[model samples]
Target: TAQYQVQDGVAVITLDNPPVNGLGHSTRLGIVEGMTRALDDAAVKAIVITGAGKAFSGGADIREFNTPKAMQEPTLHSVIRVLEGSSKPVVAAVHSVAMGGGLELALGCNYRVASKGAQIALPEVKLGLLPGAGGTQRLPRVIGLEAAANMIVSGTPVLSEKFAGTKLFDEIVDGDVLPAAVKFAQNVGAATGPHPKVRDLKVRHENPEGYLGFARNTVAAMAKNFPAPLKCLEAVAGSLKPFEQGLKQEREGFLYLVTTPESRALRHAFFGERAASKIPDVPEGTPTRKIEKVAVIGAGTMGGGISMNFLNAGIPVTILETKQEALDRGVGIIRKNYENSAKKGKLTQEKVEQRMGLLSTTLSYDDLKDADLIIEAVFEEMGVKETVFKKLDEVAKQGAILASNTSTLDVNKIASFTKRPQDVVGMHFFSPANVMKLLEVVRGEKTGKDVLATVMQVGKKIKKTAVVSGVCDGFIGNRMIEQYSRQAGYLLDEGALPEQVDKAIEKFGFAMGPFRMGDLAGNDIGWAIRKRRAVDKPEIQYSKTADLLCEMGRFGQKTGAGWYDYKAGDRKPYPNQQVNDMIVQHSKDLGITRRKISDEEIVERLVFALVNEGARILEEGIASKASDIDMVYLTGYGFPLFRGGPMLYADQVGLYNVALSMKRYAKGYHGEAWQVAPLLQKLADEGKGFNG
Candidate 1:
């Protein structure tokens, strides 16, 4: 709510909503009421609008998102209109943060006085939206078209100082913005005959056509599959027309985008990321243990990278390896990574040294006794894990958390090796753990709530998107990917070559296709899993093309060749004609006739295969919600952001269509793999979405 106060002849309207002061319905009402009260008062000469704490405002209240309250009476547009039309000079005292509608609201005022370091942005594009309340039109009038277009399209924040010489700010002050704004407002009100309005100002740009044409081409190339950026550029171009006309175009564009599948997917991903952290059984207020010191077993890539996370967070880490040579190699790699970042200007040399100094190497597990959290990133073998955990249970402190970095092994079985099962959890960091954002926090059946909560907290401290997954083979991301990989293989067996399949899915918005990913991750990993699967579940069918590829000793990039040949040190894959010949010959050997497959069919079959398995995973309680599964794929795997994730994409595509497509695929060559998941069929029958 806005608090009305009289400071001498100036009326100060303070937005009192805490924690960024999101401009909700009640707050909008208070501002309108405050404006009226100040206007009516005889003593009040000018109005000073400012936020009470933290931020001027973050944006529209996210809590009211998609609710009727968001579009309720005294909407953001109406409030901005009231501010714009005020008879008295209105000065916006912006400090800390003023973003989205907050920045738009400040633009509505007669003058804006901001604190030096205030973060200002019109970031609606991130939510697949354009700024609705005159931002697209007015910002260009204050700043240049190029600056406004970049800010609006990218949704990146700019410091207030960056706008120091710009018309966006009347005064950029060193200290408190409220008093400075009041003094500035009082002076402006006493001297001026007519208060300036931003709407009346002209948007100036030379070579408007050329600049906009260039921007269109650039944004079109960069923002492939997502329409918001190009639409934002169009809105920015509309500023050349009359103000009301431009606003009408912006409104039309925003409304159109809101109805787009891309927008829904982006919004779902935004909410899904936050929702992934919450566990159904682990309540929010559950007590968490302090993790001040960290330790890692095995100084290979995973362990060294995991140690860097804690060290980067300013927590000391002790890395233990069996051999001194391995320890030296791991430490050298860690230093090299920091030095490389330093050379790239991402980190200062001093800072790199500071982070490296926090790490220590050791040969004994006893050195890890005092560490609060111990993660074992040794080998992906049950016997190696069993040996590590049994030793950890005997030597480590009783209450210390023991975590396994197992990608495919059963986390519950790993937990069983320890006497304190409650203290064991899975902190499955993606490869190059320090760089990758996803940290799949696996909760064993007997894992303590506190232990799960603590690891999630540490995951946040190390700057990772920590998603909780229940105990299962491959957990959430890999398990779903297993089905996706299987479909890719079958697509190869049917007609599509590795390049065709990769290009089809890559065009569909995956960062990398299954075959390319297999090559990058090393195909031998899957080869080993399939070899084990041959004994464990021989009933499950797999196209022998991958097995045949492995038979040629074609592991991956590490082996110098796989599905595609990689030139040494270049990392670029050059398609080998021999591999394609092998794939064709393999298809003929299997007695399958080659047929032309459309890119559309390849994309649908590959993506929906993930959706089918994801639905089953959600039904089996392996994943809590469809959004959580989406989060897994988005952060951990290479799933595209605009398409959301597999589950949400299916929702946007209509589950009925997905299930119908699945039924059709079931009659094809590898029919057994296309069984419709029961939950998906039920949701399809109900005409419902996975997210809803």
Candidate 2:
């Protein structure tokens, strides 16, 4: 799609690949073709290169990444090499964005010019890569040492205006970058004896060794999970050597990083976020119902938070409560939250009042009758849900959506309480709804496709990663997390102490272990679920250590104790002797001997517990894709980003190995809990991953 045109003795080569002009193999060939044709034409003496819509060129083609096409003939380096050897003057006319290979191409040109607000970056480090096409070498030659190293290491984009005073750009255009570049090109081609090349400039540093040493120590400490940022320093420092040597160092670092698990995980996450939004059965242009006005039931923590999401989206909200005090309290909490954000400069003082004005609190069901959507965030009890839905059935308008915030209760049964089950869906927003990104849009048995499409649509408007979930006990995230939690308690009962378990799991990459997470979220939340399960399931085994901890009124940080004691004001957990004593005494009462459990066993047990449940979830079609389940854990449950969530992590670990590990666990005290999913076993037998 690269287009070339000639006017006024100058050839304007346009990179026409749309949606950010990704310089794939074909584009590289197109660029070479355009440059060759222009150079052969007697009328063409100067060339001005620029990009089409949205960006000049963003980077390498993500579509072609990790495949052979990336290294095909006319690679970005080869394309830039052709630019460097051009007999005629070539000027890069950049606008909107010039990043990675795009910026690298600009650097290879004889001259560079950019639009005022166009963003520029060599963001390969974000994908666990260094600039393979001389970003480290050239950027330092122009922008001085530390600035370029910081840009490469952090992988953050900066505006063209930030580099206006520097040699990074020859000129910053106020209007059209192309016309200015063309005019500049004509002038430079007509007048210049030796056009400036970035390579000709010395990479300036006051003292080489002293500066490199300081930068190395700082980057080494910061790059704990990744090797790329540190490698960026190595490449940038190598720029002081011959230009050829610096390029070789960069290529070596890039090749080494491309083979690392860390880069693969980062790349997986890069694509996984995009993949999570696509529902297999749902297509683009499917009509969706508008969520213009919203109503929330209850005035508790969840209800207030849920209402804030709509308010933040600039939609008017009416929150219903039984009493005036509760309604006022909920609205007040919403106001304070906005105020807190305003105080921290996350929001303006005017914006706080602006959002507050959109929120209207009420005690009447009649006030919510006209709302386009109603989300019930009442008590988690089924009876409370039934009562709320029946009342919603009485007053909610025709075609209006009715949804729930239930974490554990059955959604289909809740929909049954409504006259229009097609209108009933579950929007299971995570706790502190305004903050968490996960929105499990639970589709009921009779939920209309339009309703499904609508909730998913609005979920995006509010900036949440909306995952479609089939109606079940905990939908997708909590259903799998429950198994992970169960295994944690099981580990405690077997031998591992709370601290050891937390340390092991934290090392494995969970943001927190089950017990510490339980403490922070309130130990009583799980206690209530267990207490209800005591009647419902009856046969499911649980370690009662948490129950005894609750029996002593140690709810969590609020009560200064849980699995670990908390200092009065600080949220940091301090190991409590009493909690350890309770665990040891509880094991004695069970006639079990405590033994040292390896960290390897702890990681596998907790992680595999989630993976097994996720496979079951996938087989049941509660979660449409393995990646969707990974997104739920990645966004909601603090599954490690470096591992690319539990499902992808399992894929990396090999399903055969995962199944064999599960088989080993099945021989343990919690053997019944290790019932491997048939899907997992089948996949293991087939030697396939969950993602495969």
Candidate 3:
């Protein structure tokens, strides 16, 4: 994938892979062959290597990663060796993007030039890796040690203009980069022997020991469970040593990270996020409807938050409420949210008004006739949803997309309420929808592909990690979360207190433990769901402690009491002795002696419960792949990003090991809930992971 051309004694090799030339096996071969040819021809005074399309190179070819193709004869490392070993000067013409291996290749060249506004980075740290192709050894020689360390560790790109006075670039061109590079190459080609190479330059640092110590401590504190950031810093610190020594350290770090479970999980999540967008039946090219105007039913938190997303996306929204008071309140709350953001300096006063100006409120469904989309966020009740949907059916324009923001109700049933089931879909936005990134696009049995595709596109426009879930009791996230909560309840019943159970899982990487999450989300919501479940699914069992707590009117932070106590203004939960006494009394009421539960046991039960349910969801086709579930957890549920997701976490732990843990838990209380999912059992028996 490289094209060779010679113009005026300059041999130009263009990385021909479109859509960001990734230095894959073929491209690596092309570069090597072209370099050899340029050296063989005395007429070719210089060689210029540049990308053909939009980007110079994004990084190593992700398509060939973990395959033999990546390490073939002309590996990235081998190609870099050839560039560094070249007798003739090689000039790297960087434009658009030069990241990871792309930047590493540029560093290997004798001279480097870049275009203004081009992005540059060695972002291997993001995938739990350090740049392996002499990036650590050579980068500091061009850019200073501190700047290179910050860039490599954070994996954040900086503009080429920022490197103006640095040795990283020989020139920064404003015009077409190739021509500028060609002219620059001509001048460099005419120079005397011993042309400049980044490797020959010495790396400089003001205070190596002082600065590196500060950076290590800061990175370690911020990295938490992730090992790559600190490891990346170690690789950068190696730059202070000799070049070969630094290169060896970088290679060792890369190899070590490749074997780490944390690195594997991070890589799985990276691929999983991209894979989540693909629907099996819905082709990527499926026709989608235009959503120009949106109307939301209700004037409550959910509705207002939903309206904010469309408004932020520059889509006009009309909110329909039952009364003027509720409409005014909803409008006021939305503006207040914007005002708070402006006050925090996240938004300007003008920007806040601009978003608010996109929102309209009305009491009549007739006013929504021209809306391209109408979303019902009235309430999570079948009867209330039926009334609103029926009115929407009568008033909404034909072909308008109808979406219900229901979390647990039957999306199919919601669709059945309307005549045009094909046009009906579920866009279940997480609570505080404007702030949360997860959106479950619940697909009804009869939901049209076009409608589903359009909702996903809109979800993307609104900056949501939209995942498709087949109609089920709670869809993907909540369905798996239900099992986790059930395990938490049983842990409570067995021995662990709210604080103990919460602290265990929080240490295990969950943002908050189940009880703390319950307190923040409001226990009354779960109480209401349980009340409905009693009639709808009586076979399902729940721990009585939660119901008893709700019965006592300790709803959560809203009520200033629940599993934990809260002050009037401070959000930190204060442990309540009364709640602990009630929990102990409930355990005794069940005629069981309380025994200490291990933090390990608590984490296993909660995490494995999610894994089992996720396996079932995958088998039932409720979710297409494990990574989609991981995306839901990572983006929406505050599941630890380091573990990937429950499914991937299980995979990393060895499914066999997880099954063994589940079996051990089953021998205790709630043995019925510990029945290993058939998929999980099968995969474990075969010694496979959930993702593989």
Candidate 4:
């Protein structure tokens, strides 16, 4: 409920809800009543509205989603309309976050004053809807149409600095926005000044090239399978028409989007991300460690990229290399990266210099002794990592967090080497770590709650989505990758050419098909890992085709040969008869007869293997939620977002059907390595989804 107080002839209304201070049905009603009382009070000259808790308002109460009474009640919209129509100037004082309905409420106000730490956004597109309130209409009136469209369509939040530059807020205050708002309101009332927001502001003129055309193209490219982003564009475009007509158009688009299946799925996805943090045994009070400084123990490509992530997050890093030449090379790469970002307009020259200043290079392990966190991105050899950790165990400060960027190694074994095993964890940043947004935070056997929490926080700091993973041989991403890669090899043995399989998978929404991805990453990298692992552990299965290719020096694009032939500058793949002959000869030697493979079979084999592996990952507790696994693949492996990642794609393609296909494949291959997991069978039997 809102509490009204008169201070210095200004009516100040406070929304007294804890935590996020979400405006529910009664809260919205209370706000309207408070404004009415403020307008009626002869003693009151103007009004200032602010939240009582941490934030102004996060948004509408999400708890109301399950209740019919809450849904039927007058929403945040009705209160916003009342605020806009009020005669007295209403100043909105914002801090923390004003998102979705909260932003809509702010948009309806005459003026907005935000504290330096305030965040504002309309993230309805992420929930699979445009803002049903006046967000689409009024946001364009405040910020220009292009900027407003980008925020709504992308569903990304903006910091106060970004918002101020967009001219969304009237003034940015230093300490408290409420005091500034109260003062501004009194000054405005003294002068009898009109509210700038309510003035007849021109809607941004439509682009000469039809505004809807660009919107259509953007939605088609970015939100192919999602309906909300396109609908958001339509709502924003509607503002160009007359006010009444525009409101009706916006309403229609919002309603249509809310009813879409894609929205329902996206809402599920939103909840899924929140649910990913939940664990049965872990209590809420689990203490987290503070991480101020980070140390990187190697200076290779992955190490440099990983260091950049920390520097970009404003975390100072101490990067150590074994030798000066390697250290200089890594520092040079980091400098070139910042220079390129500045040239591309992604970062200002001043900002680049500031970030570079955060990075300090050295060759001494003692330099990292006082570091709050250390991430090692050395070669993927267990002995090498164990030795590094042993030294780190002796030197690292007590309670300091330790992590590795090993993609396929067992984190449990590495953790075992340290005395503070609870502090040891896996921070699996994908290749080109600074560019990729996925960070698989693998929790070792003795990993503490603080370590997990700190890594998740670090991921957010670096603008990456961190998903927790239980310690396993390959964790979530690479474990599932093995099945997909194996299926591609098996498809070749079944007479499906590499290009045919690659093209089919690409059409299924993978950015690059399996073979193309293999070529781009350089097959030799995996070849070396495979050979090393095979020598150490003879029990593990190996793909004969991949091994034979490695032996022939067909290491992919770097060698100008692998599955396909590539010229120096050409991107397209040309058929290589040499690879074809190798496949035929290899299959015949194994007494396997090549059978004609259909496009459908190729897709089913590759995708089903992924789905089957996902089930195993989920059941083994390697991944906390299906969405976490999906996010890992989507952000790291270039799985299509439109399809909502591989796991969601499997759910879309009936789980029962996937299970059936996996059963058939297992039987046909006499129980191949790609056997369907029992958890999938259980879900299929219960007619439920992997996520639910």
Candidate 5:
């Protein structure tokens, strides 16, 4: 992580690791080696520490955790102790980056001289840990209490120039950090016998008790499911106490959190996202076709939304519709979405016009001939899909990729509509596609490797976590979510009301439960799917309570009535007495007596429902890895991050325990859907997790 360079009575220590110059075990040893060399050299009067590239340091390398190397001698604390006790002056030349232990290491120096734009922060709180390397004590000592308190608690970075006059930085250099720091170090070394260490500085605060009490209350309220923020406040408040005492407490807090379930979940999510992009079949250097211009085959919600992603990425889009009025309406919505973006300060007025400039409208398939990629975001019906693809097959230029935005239709079947089935793929963008970060790139049976590669690259270009899903009825996310919805429906039939079901899941940390999610997505959408399923999968059962509500002209927020009623303008739901009565009537009509359902049972049933289906999806190779399923749910389906998605959650609970719980639910309600996947049982029997 570092290299030693000595010249002109100065020992220059460079953090050599590229990208973010992560401070790992080797780096810690190297830094201490540089410090020892400078201390031993009689000619060397000062030591200047700086990074080789972009970052001074990004923090401790997370990969080191769970390994003996992390706790090896000359840890970050030991290295910092050496810096603080250095006989000669030590200067930190921070540039472009500094965070967590990196920031703490810099603070341990006699003085810090940073470049103008260096980002300084202690972001360990974001990963469910407090800064373990004296950051809490020392940061508040350098920066004021209020500023340091906010920075640590919120885990937000501040620019180097923002603290130019503050003690956090000795000087804000305009030129090369190394040269400036060397000169600063030389001056300090030549002039002073006594060096200024951050540990020796008093943490400036008046009436500390009052301020910390208020901070505790504020942090406690905002911490929510995470306990680190509260620990962060406690660590920062410890600055008023002795520096050594505070550091000990910080170390204790950090060690506790590093082994916590929340930390493990955060770590899994961090690594899972990186793993999601790597498709084992699709090599990193696979050749991809260029997607210069995009054409969308509908001007409705999905089509307009899909086009916005390309336009946002600075690609030209031509949206085609059969009717001129519909085209006008679709194009109008696109402009309005941009306008709304500008109104909200998300985009500037000029940027909105520029995006609108990238958009064009078309009424003919002939107009889409030049499009490099044609996406059919038309109605989600087989007949509609077939017609659109046939036209696309006829009109789209050779080598141009054809795609569908259908959420629950078969990608393989849609691909067969075209002569060039190899060019067809699925780009299943979630609702309000412009805002959502998830894109399910559904690969068909004959879809070309190049076609798959191109869409994945383009998906990233538009800022989406593109996950591969093999051809299936609902693909990965929707397929699993269907089982979750079934369990939610069954919960209602057995005992729970809509609000109780929603509250239970919400308490478990979902963004929304099935009922509220249905309302937001429009109940008619699911009602239509259930209608299709009645013929397609008639053996499958569903609670008729939802169909009854839909039949009564209640289609969710669009109709101001669903599982819960909504006001005309506001989206907030109020318990609907009529809907609850409907649910009770259905239970009575079926000659079944409803019983009280525990919140614990409600959660296990709903989450395990997804887990069971996800196991099948993985076994069928629809999703290549358990983490990929986790990625889809985390980014697309609003799975709680702290639980690390369904599969990881199962691992935390132990597969054997999950299997036992599923068996318990098998006899109660909707027993057919409760059968555990073979893969799940196999893993449980083997005592292994999904990822393993």
Candidate 6:
């Protein structure tokens, strides 16, 4: 609840809730009472309302959604009516985020004054509802119907620039908003002119042609997947009628959308993101070390991109290579990356120069002696990593953190070669680290909490969303990649061509298929790793088709021939009859029976393989939670965000059904690779989801 105080003929109502002062039932009633008292008092000439805490309000209380008769509360609508009927000018002083019902409440006020950092949106559509209060009726009356429809349906926030342009707020204050609002209220008390907002305002309702088409197209595209977007459009369209008619239409639409399954899924996603920050083993208040300076070994594309992350975070970096020529080439590539960013308008030329100045290149280990953290981004050989760690142990600062950027090697073995094993960790960055946003922070057996926290903090500073992973053969991302790769190989053994498999996955919402991805990354890269891992293990299953292609120098786009043939300087991949014949011949030689596979089976097999591997990762404790694995895929692998990542999609499809399908596949084929993990089976048997 909030309290009202009258000082110097101005009445100030302060919402006194901690965290976000959401306008719950009692709070709405209290606001109405405060407005009535202000109107009754003879001494009060103007009214100012502001929250006392971090934000004006977050939204409606989500807990109330489960209450049986929560919608029966009439205080919210009554408060809006009272504010609109005020004789004296009512000002809303907003800070932080004024979202959902908070924005609706502000719309009821005659004027709004917001701080510079304040954000405002009617994001109720994200929760499967339009703004239920006065948002639908009043917003279009202020901002145009088309813009209001866009804002409500897309659930995108309006920043101060756009908010000002739309006339949503009267003033944007650079400092504290409440004091400025008080001054504004006092100034308005002396004026005799009527507010333009209450007078002959029909611009938004008049523009029927533009708004009608925009609403039609937006609803058509969005409503097929979600019900809220279309309901929001209907509410905005009602603004062409009287205000009371629009409000009634908005309430009906809001009630209908709130009960939808899509709303529940969206709310789960919102809470899941917040829940991810709390790691079970990493206790709160764990001390973290500062990392101001970094050093990297190797100067290839991966190493150079890794250095760019540190430089972008405003940390000084020194990159070392075995030879001067390689070091010069790496530095040249780094400069070219910055130049490209400047050309794309992502960075100014001066900013690129400043970042380049922060990166240093050398060929000696002596220059890395003062570095706070050193990462070896060299080749993926275990022996090379151990040797580098051994040298780093002797050359690096005593308490400096040591890390390996290997995507699939055993991190424990690399840590064993270092003197300070507690400080050793694995930081596997995706390709082109300067542009990618995912970092897998692999924790070895001896890695300390302080070291893990330091890397997580550093990842954030570089704008990467890092998920901590336990030590495993390939960590989280590569482990899932292994399953998908195997599925593609099995599909090839069947009658499906590479292009057919690629098209199916792309249609399923992936940006690229396994073959297209492999070609772009270079087939020789995986071929070399496979060769190295299979050196002493003849028992491991091997794919000869990929190996023969790599041996023939048909690497990928770089070599102009791979799973598909490529034009000289173009990236468009067309099907090659020669590669198709090779695959068929290879399958025949191995005594494999080829069968025509349906597109549905191809998509299910590849995607289910990823889901099954994610289950294994969860069971092994390699990934802390299912959502963390989803976050990795979403940020790194271009998993469609609208699907809410793979784990969420699994839940939506029913894990029990997926496990049954896995069982059928196992009976048809046979092996540990295709078997569903015990944890997934257990959850499926219990009719539970991976989410809490």
Prediction RMSDs, each to the true structure: 1.4, 1.8, 1.4, 4.8, 1.8, 3.9
What is candidate 2's local distance difference test score? 0.88
Clashing residue pairs, candidate 4?
A: none
Ten-residue region with minimum lDDT total, candidate 5: 531-540
Better of 4 and 6 by TM-score: 6
Better of 3 and 6 by TM-score: 3
506 Cα displacement, candidate 6 (Å): 1.3
Pick by lDDT: 1 or 5, better one = 1
Residue 496 in candidate 5, Cα distance off native in Å:
2.1
Q: What would the per-residue lDDT of candidate 2 be over residues 12-65, giving only the tens digit for each residue?
A: 999988788999988899899999998999888899999998899998888888
In order of appearance, the predictions have TM-scores of 0.98, 0.96, 0.98, 0.82, 0.96, 0.88
- State in Å the error of residue 129, model 2: 1.5
Full-model lDDT for every candidate: 0.90, 0.88, 0.90, 0.82, 0.89, 0.82
lDDT of 1: 0.90
Q: What is the lDDT of residue 213 in candidate 4?
A: 86
TM-score attained by model 1: 0.98
Off by over 4 Å in 5: 62-69
* lDDT digits (tens) for residues 45-73 of candidate 3: 88999998788898799898889898898
Regarding lDDT, does 2 or 4 come out ahead? 2
Compute the lDDT of residue 512 as modeled in candidate 3: 85
